[PDB]
Design an enzyme around this catalytic site. Structure first.
Site, PDB file in Angstrom:
ATOM      1  N   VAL A 265       0.873  -1.172   0.000  1.00 30.87           N
ATOM      2  CA  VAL A 265       0.000   0.000   0.000  1.00 30.87           C
ATOM      3  C   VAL A 265       0.914   1.226   0.000  1.00 30.87           C
ATOM      4  O   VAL A 265       1.841   1.319   0.813  1.00 30.87           O
ATOM      5  CB  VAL A 265      -0.954  -0.005   1.229  1.00 30.87           C
ATOM      6  CG1 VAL A 265      -1.898   1.190   1.214  1.00 30.87           C
ATOM      7  CG2 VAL A 265      -1.745  -1.314   1.301  1.00 30.87           C
ATOM      8  N   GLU A 266       0.628   2.159  -0.907  1.00 30.24           N
ATOM      9  CA  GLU A 266       1.467   3.337  -1.186  1.00 30.24           C
ATOM     10  C   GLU A 266       1.781   4.195   0.037  1.00 30.24           C
ATOM     11  O   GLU A 266       2.805   4.884   0.082  1.00 30.24           O
ATOM     12  CB  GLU A 266       0.776   4.214  -2.239  1.00 30.24           C
ATOM     13  N   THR A 267       0.883   4.174   1.011  1.00 32.87           N
ATOM     14  CA  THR A 267       1.054   4.945   2.246  1.00 32.87           C
ATOM     15  C   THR A 267       1.950   4.234   3.265  1.00 32.87           C
ATOM     16  O   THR A 267       2.332   4.818   4.281  1.00 32.87           O
ATOM     17  CB  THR A 267      -0.323   5.283   2.839  1.00 32.87           C
ATOM     18  OG1 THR A 267      -1.189   4.143   2.724  1.00 32.87           O
ATOM     19  CG2 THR A 267      -1.012   6.332   1.980  1.00 32.87           C
ATOM     20  N   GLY A 268       2.271   2.970   2.999  1.00 31.61           N
ATOM     21  CA  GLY A 268       3.226   2.244   3.831  1.00 31.61           C
ATOM     22  C   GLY A 268       2.938   0.815   4.271  1.00 31.61           C
ATOM     23  O   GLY A 268       3.882   0.037   4.404  1.00 31.61           O
TER      24      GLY A 268
END
EC number: 2.8.3.8
Lengths: 487, 512, 512, 512
Positions: free
Chosen positions: A322-325
C-alpha cells in the site's frame, strides 16, 4: 512566535488556542490520508471555525502530501473558505473536493507534484536541500514541457524545471518548507516523544515535523493521551519530542472517520482469525500476477484483487503493498506484515520495486496515454498514480470500456497526460489495459489480444493474430480453479 | 544469479556459500558502525577468507556509509588484501585503518563523502535518483574547487560537481547504487521480514537494502534467529522480506564486539537504575549548553559532557543526540529516549537541528578552519563531522592546545603542564579543510575553540583568545604554541576557577 | 449437555443462546467485583431476560465470591426475580441489594463465607477437596457457635463445622462446586485460550473455571474479541482453552460500568503523569502507617488515606494492596505495581501479611466487637472484612462516633459538632459479630478505633479512650454518646493539632 | 533477623553474604525443577561452600516441592554434606541422589508428599492453615495405613493422618511453613518486584515466597538483573517486592544447566518454525489419545508420544500439559500455549482434569498396583506420579516387560527379543505401593499397561492380557517372565501390525 516549554514540558493547548498561533500567509502542512487516517481533525476543525467566526488568519498556503477526507466535506474541505487559502500543493486533490473546486474555478494557485515526489521534497526541505532530481513525471502533465504540474489558468510560477545529469533527462522539483504542521500520534510523553501504537500507519509524520521544525516553524501534534516522561519504549518512539511545539490532547481520537473505538487488529497487535463486472476485471487482473511478485492494488475497480486471490487460494503466494506504507494484510487492513513510513515506500516504488501495478483509468488514448488527474472538467490529482506507473515492471490499467451481457451501455487524444505510453515503451515496460469486454496490450505500433464472450467487436487499435475470447472460467459464478504462474 | 525462493522461503545459507554469489568488480555496501554495531561479521569474515584461499573475487568496490571496526584489524580491515578491493567510498576511514592504509599508499581509488550525505545518496539511489543537491561540504575538501572528496593522487573521476540554484552555491553528489549488501537484523521470519529488537540501533539498513534491491543486486542479511512466517509484530518490522535475498543465521550473533550475551538494557527493553584535561575540556564545553537545547554526543574529548552534566545535576534539562540514530540515554547508551534511522538523523542535522554542536579538532588554522579528516600523514575521514559543523547554531570545537602525549596535572585550582605536546595544532594554513571558518561566519554561526589552557572565539578578524587557564603563561604556553597570533580580547579573563577544582562546580545551566 | 467443539474450536454463541444451556436447579458461579469489574454482563442480562420472558430456568443456586454491581439494580440484582434463585452463597451481599432483599425477607437460603475463604473453597473444589480448615472467622457470626454464616431464619443446613488439629480450634468450610460459570476475559483465541490485557484485574477467573470444569459443568466466557489460534503470548494466557465450553463475544465490552472506551492506563500499559470529617479520620489513620509497611486500601471513610499520603509526600514510602488483587497505584487505580489473582491475595492476608489494615465499622460493642455484615435491618455481608481483620498486625477501625445526619465543622484547629448524629454506633452488645475483640486480643493484635472526635485502643479490660479532639466535651460528646463506659487512659491526650488545620501537616512517616 | 531496607530498596547481596543469614535448624525451601529450571544455583552453591569451609550452619530441614538437579551431583546434591541436613520433605527424591542416598542410609529424617499435595500445603501454610484434606494418595505408601509417606526406618513422626468427611476417606497432610526460601526470577526492580520473562516457567515461586514471608522468615531471590523502581509492567510482575528480603544478582544466570545464552523461544517470545522399543510403546500409547483430550506425558519411555503425534499428523488435535505448569508446545519446550503456576496445575489434576495420562512404571503386581518411588534398593520418590494417577479418567502405564539390559530389535514387522532382561517387573506383590489397582477400580478409572511385547487392562479379577506383539511367544516371553498369572482375554489379539513397521502408520485420531 511559539509558546515556551515551561520546565521542559511541551505546551498542551486546546485546538482553538493552538491554531491562534498561525499567522497570515503561513504555509500549512497537513498530515493524513483518506477516511481520517492519521488526521489531526481537531486542528483542521479549529482552524476552519476560526476563519468562519473571525475571517482570520488570511491567505494561507496548504501542503497536503496526500489526499485527506471522504471525497466530500471532510478532510481539508472545511478549509475551502474564500480568503483562508490562496495557494495549494497536494499529492491528491479529489479527496477534499471543496479545495479542488476552488482550483477548478481559478480561485487559488494549485500544483500537483506526484505524491511520492512531494513527500520526498518535504524530506529534502527538512535537510535544507533546494529540490530533488527525479525522472518520475517525465512525459506527463507535471513535465514543464506540458503543464509543469500546474492545475489551472491562474497558476503561473514554475516549481518544476527540466535538468541534465549524465547527459540524461530528469525533472527538478523545488522543495518547499512549511511554516506550520498539523501532525498526530497515538500517545506522547510530557516532552512530546510520540508513539503510533494505535494509528493505522505512519505516513510521513517525522518528515513533516522535521521540515517544519528546521524552518523555524510550529509543529502541532494531536494525540489521544499523554504519559509520564521517559516511560515509552525508545524503539516505539517515531517522533522525538523537541520536534513538537504544541500538543493537543483529543481523548476521543478515533483511528478512522466514524468514531469507532480503537480496533487492536488495525493497531497491529492481534492476528484476525458476487460475479459482477468489477470482480471480472479484478479476476482478469489477477492473471497478470505471479508467485514471488511484489504488487500494488490501486484505489478503484482493482481493489478486489486480494479477495479474488483469497478465494482462489493463492493470496499467500505473492505480496501487495500500500502506497502509504502498509505491506500485506487482509480486509484499514489487518494482519499486515510490515508498515514503512510513506516516503520510504515511494523510494522503493521509484526505483522500480513493483513487479506488477494495478491502476484505474478515467480516459485512454490512441498512443496508450492514460488520464486520471483530470476528467469531466473536475480535478482529481494523481495520488501515487505517477510514482507507480512510471517505473513498475508490469503496468495493468483497469476499468470499463465506457458469457457477458451488456445491459445499458454508456477510450479517446488526451487533453492532459498522467501516463505516457511512449515513455513506458522506452523504459521497456509491459503495459496492459483490462476491460469488462476486451483486453489490450501496448506495442510500438495497442493490440487487441482478447475479447469478452457475448459481445460484438474514437480510434482503431491494431489487432492480434491471436485475438482470442477471454478465459471462460472468468465468466462463471464458480471457483475459477486459477493457478498462479510460477516464479 | 541469486538463489530461488523455494515456496516463498528466503534462502538460508552459510556465510561461506553466501559470498560465493559475489562476482568480480561488484559494488559491496557494508552496514555497520564502530565496535561491532549492526555488523554482519560472518559475511565479512567469509569474503576475507575466500579471498585469502582463492584470490577471488576481484576488484570489488566498497561503500561504507560509516566507519566499521575497532581502529585496528576488525571492521572491513580484513578486506584490505591486495587485489580484493580497487575502489572505496566511506563516510569515515580511521575505524578500519588497513583500508585507509591502501588509500594512503595510492593502492586504491578512495572517496570521502560526508557520512550524512553519503547515506542520503544511497537513499537517492534506491529511488533511482542520479544524485543529491546539498550545501553540506561547500568550502571544504569535498568541494570540487578543493579536493572533491578524493583522498589520494590515483583518485581521478569527479563524483562531486558545483551547481547553482536560487542564486546559491550547492554541491551535486553523484548517487552510486551497490550490487551487494552485507546487512543485519536480530530476527527475521521465514520470508525475510526482519526486526531489530536486540540491535544497538537501526542505522541505514533499509536504505541499503532498497538501494541494492532496486539496482538488481543481491541483499545478504545476517540474523541471530529465524522464526515462523508472519508471527512478528508488523510495527516492529523494519525490513520487508522481498528486499532480502540471502539470510545467514548466526546463533552466536553479539550486539557489539566482545562476545557478551544479549544486554536487554542496550536492547531498549529495560530502564537501568577524575579531574584531568579531558574532564576539564568537557566541563568548559558544558558551559555552552542551555536548558532545552539540542546537542550531539561528541566522539573524542567531548564524550565526557554527559557525565559532567550528570554530576552537575542538569543532564535531564537538555538532550544529546547520537549521529547514528539514538537520542538521549546514559553510559552503546542505555535509557535512550528514541532511535531514528541514521539517514533521518542527518536530515535533521543538515537543516540546522542542533542548537549546540560539539566536535574534536586535530588542527585549527588562522582563518579558524578545522581539520580532522587528514593529519599526522594519516587518513581519518570525516564521520559526521561535516554534516554537523556545516549548519549547527553553535559550533564548539574541543581539544587540547598541543598534540602528541601532552600531560597535565590539575592541582591547587591551577593547570600545570608537566609534559608539553610535541606537535602544534594551531597552525597557519590547513593543508586540507574539514570545516571552513569563512563559511561559518557567512552562515552566521557561533564558533568556539575550547582547549585545556585557553578558549577562543572566531571573529571576522580571526580567532580571539577570550579565556586563559590559571597556572599557564600566555607567551610561553599559548602564543609560542601557535603558528599565528590571535587577537587578544580586551575582555580576556581567567577560565572559571571552579573548572580546576576537584569537586562539583555547582554549575547552573542557563535558561532556555 | 454442552455444545460440541466443531473442528477443535470452542463454540461461540450469543448470550441468549448460551444461557439456554442452564437447567433448573443448576449452581451458577458469577465472576466479578463492584461497578462492573470483570463482569460478564451479557450473560447475566440474558439469564435475567430469559426468566422475565419465560419463567425458566428455576430454583438456581448462586455463588458470588464477591459483591457484584452498583448497590442498586445492576450486578446480580436482575437475578432476584422471584422463583429464579432459591439459594445463594456470597462473600458480599449489599452490592446487589435486590438479592440481599430476598434473604432479608426469608425467600432464599442465604450464606456468607468470608470472601477470601469463599474463593479458597472454590479452589479446593477444583481439586475435589471436601473443604478447607481455617481459623478465619473463629468467634464471629460465621462460627457455628453463633450463626454459622447463615443470614436468615429459613437457612438451616450447616456448611461450617468446628474441628480440632494440633489442639487448636479451626473452622471447616464445606467446598461447594458450581455447575455453571459466567466468567470473562479481554481476548481469547479460537480454542478459548484467554488473556486479560485490558481487564481491571484477574479476580478468581481461573479458579472458577477449574471448579466448574472439574465438576462436569459448563464454563461460559465473555470476551471483547477473538483471535487466531496460538497467536497470544503464552505468558499472558490466564485461562487454558480446554476449560472454556462456550464463548460469548461482546465487542462493546467495557472495563467498568458506564460504557467508557478502553482506558490503557487502567489496562496497566502506560504510566499516568477539603478538610471535612472524612479527611480528619483518614489523616489520623495515616498516623498508624510506617515506612515499608503493607496495608490494604479500605472501603468507606478510610479510602482517602492514599490521597492524604500524597498530599503529605509519603505515598511512596509504604504500599497499599487491594483485596481483589491489585498492588499499589493511584486514583480502577492506575500505575499499579503488580496484580495478583484474588485467591492468592487472600492467602497472603490470612497468614497475617498486612502490617496495617483499615476498616470501617457500623457498630462497636463493649468487648470491642465490630459489626458490619448486618445493621439497620439490612444485610450487607462481609466482603473481605473478616479475612483482613482476623490476623493483620494492626487493626484500625475508622468511622464517626455517631451516625445519621451528623454534621461537624473543622474551624480554628477544633472540631465543632454543629449537629449531633441520630444513631449511637457504640452499643452495649452486638446482635451479630463480624470481628471479635476477644479473638484479636488472643491473637496479640493491636486494635484501634478512630472517630472524628475520639480515638480508642482495645485492651483486656475493654476500650481505652486514648485521644480526644480539641473542641469536644468529654462528658457530653463522648461518654453520653456511648452505651458503655470506656476506660479513660491516664495518658488521655488531645488529638494532634495538625489534624484539624487546613494546611499540610508536615507529617513525618515513622521509620521501618 | 533480616538486613534492613535502605530507602525502601531491597538489600542486594552476594550469595556468600546472603546465606550467612541462615541459622542452625532453619527450614529451607528450594525453588526449582530438573536440569536447572528456576534454580537459584548461586545460593545453593554458596551454602554448600560455607558448610564445607565452616561446618555451619547445622541440622537444616529441607523442603523441595519437586526434584532439582541432573540425577547426580547438581541440584541439592551439594547439600548432602553430613550434618548440614537432618530432615527433608521432597516431592521427588531421585533428581538429587546424594540426598536420597542419605535417606537410604538412614542418616536423615525423610518424607515424600505427592508433589502436587506438597506445593498445595505450602500455599496452605502461607494462609496459616494447619493442613489440607485430600483423597490424593489414599491406598498408597503415603496413606498412614501403609507408610504415611516415610521413606526409611529413622522417620517416625506422623505428618499424614486419615480423616473422614461426608462418610468418605481423606488424608490430612500437615502444612509446614519454611524459614528460608531460595527462589529466583529473571528481573526485579529496586524494591524486589519480580518478572519471569526469560524463565522456563513459574513453578510455585509466589507460594514459596508467601509461605516463608508469613512465617517470619527470610526470602532470598536470585535474579539476572535489576531495574529502576516501578518500570516493569504490573501484569508481568509475579512476585510483589515486599515478599523478598534479599536479592542476589547473577548476570551469568542461565535458563537451564549448561550455560547456554538466553533462548527467546524458551522465554515464550517467538514462534519456532527411529523405530525402537521406546517408539513402539509411544505409538501404542498414542492409540489411547482422543480428539480434543487433555493429557500429560510423563518422563520416561512415553515421552516420545508428542514426536509420534507430529509424525502421524495429529499433534494439534489434542493438548499435553506438563505438571510444572506449561501447556502445549514442542521439543525445554517451545511454542507453548500457556504457562500456569505449578500449584494451579495440580489443582486441575487433582479434580480429574486429565482425560489421559501416561506414566512410566518400575514394577507392577498382580493387583495392578504400580511402584516407582522405590526400586532396586533406591529412593526415587513420586514426583507428580500420585497426583496424576489418582483421579485421571484413563491411566496408561508404559514400560518394558522386563528390565536389566533388555535388547530388542524391530524387523520384518515383528519384535525380536535379542537379549532378554535380567529383571522381572511384573511381580507377585509390590513391597511398596505408588498406585493402587483397587482404588483406581473404586474410582471407576480405565487402567492400561502397555509394554513392547504385551498390553494389559486392569479389571476386578486383575490384569487381562489383551494384546500380544507379533514375533513373541505367549508362554515363554510373557507368562514365564511374570511372577503372577494374568487373565488371558478371550478377545486376545496381535498388537496392531502398523506399530511394528518403519513407516508412518496412517493413524487417525478418534473423537469420543
Amino acid at each position: 512566535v511559539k509558546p515556551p516549554r515551561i520546565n521542559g514540558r511541551v505546551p498542551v493547548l486546546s485546538a482553538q488556542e493552538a491554531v491562534n498561533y498561525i499567522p497570515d500567509e503561513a504555509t500549512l502542512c497537513v498530515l493524513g490520508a483518506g477516511g481520517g487516517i492519521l488526521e489531526a481533525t481537531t486542528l483542521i476543525t479549529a482552524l476552519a471555525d476560526k476563519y468562519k467566526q473571525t475571517q482570520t488568519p488570511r491567505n494561507l498556503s496548504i501542503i497536503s502530501p496526500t489526499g485527506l477526507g471522504d471525497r466530500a466535506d471532510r478532510g481539508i474541505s472545511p478549509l475551502a473558505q474564500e480568503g483562508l487559502v490562496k495557494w495549494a500543493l497536494c499529492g491528491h486533490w479529489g479527496q477534499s473536493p471543496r479545495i479542488s473546486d476552488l482550483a477548478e474555478q481559478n480561485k487559488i494557485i494549485a500544483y500537483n507534484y506526484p505524491q511520492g515526489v512531494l513527500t520526498q521534497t518535504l524530506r529534502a526541505a527538512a535537510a535544507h536541500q533546494p529540490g530533488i532530481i527525479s525522472d518520475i513525471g517525465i512525459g506527463t502533465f507535471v513535465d514543464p514541457r506540458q503543464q509543469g504540474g500546474k492545475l489551472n489558468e491562474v497558476t503561473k510560477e514554475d516549481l518544476i524545471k527540466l535538468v541534465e545529469f549524465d547527459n540524461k533527462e530528469y525533472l527538478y522539483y523545488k522543495a518547499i518548507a512549511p511554516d506550520i504542521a498539523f501532525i498526530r500520534a497515538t500517545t506522547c510523553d510530557s516532552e512530546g516523544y510520540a508513539t503510533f501504537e494505535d494509528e493505522v500507519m505512519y505516513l510521513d509524520a517525522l518528515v513533516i515535523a522535521q521540515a517544519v521544525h528546521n524552518n523555524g516553524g510550529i509543529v502541532m501534534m494531536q494525540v489521544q493521551k499523554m504519559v509520564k516522561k521517559a516511560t515509552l519504549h525508545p524503539k516505539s518512539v517515531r517522533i522525538p519530542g523537541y520536534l513538537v511545539d504544541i500538543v493537543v490532547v483529543d481523548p476521543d481520537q478515533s483511528q478512522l472517520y466514524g468514531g469507532a473505538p480503537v480496533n487492536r487488529f488495525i493497531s497491529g497487535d492481534f492476528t484476525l482469525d458476487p460475479l459482477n463486472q468489477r470482480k471480472l476485471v479484478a479476476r482478469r487482473a489477477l492473471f497478470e500476477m505471479r508467485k514471488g511478485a511484489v504488487g500494488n492494488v490501486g484505489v478503484g475497480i482493482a481493489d478486489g484483487i486480494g479477495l479474488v486471490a483469497r478465494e482462489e487460494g493463492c493470496a499467500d503466494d505473492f505480496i501487495l503493498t500500500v502506497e502509504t506504507g502498509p505491506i500485506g494484510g487482509i480486509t484499514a487492513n489487518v494482519n499486515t506484515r510490515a508498515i514503512l513510513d510513506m516516503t520510504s515506500q515511494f523510494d522503493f516504488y521509484h526505483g522500480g520495486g513493483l513487479d506488477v501495478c494495478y491502476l484505474s483509468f478515467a480516459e485512454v488514448d490512441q498512443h496508450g496515454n492514460v488520464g486520471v488527474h483530470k476528467f469531466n472538467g473536475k480535478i482529481m490529482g494523481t495520488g501515487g498514480f505517477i510514482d507507480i506507473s512510471a517505473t513498475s515492471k508490469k503496468i495493468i490499467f483497469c476499468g470499463t470500456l465506457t458469457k457477458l451481457n451488456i445491459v445499458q451501455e454508456g477510450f479517446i487524444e488526451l487533453p492532459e497526460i498522467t501516463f505516457s505510453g511512449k515513455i513506458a515503451l522506452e523504459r521497456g515496460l509491459d503495459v496492459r489495459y483490462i476491460t469488462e469486454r476486451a483486453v489490450f496490450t501496448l506495442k510500438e505500433d495497442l493490440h487487441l489480444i482478447e475479447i469478452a464472450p457475448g459481445v460484438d467487436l474514437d480510434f482503431t487499435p491494431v489487432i492480434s493474430p491471436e485475438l482470442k475470447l477471454m478465459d471462460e472460467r472468468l465468466f462463471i459464478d464458480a471457483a475459477m480453479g486459477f493457478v498462479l504462474p510460477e516464479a
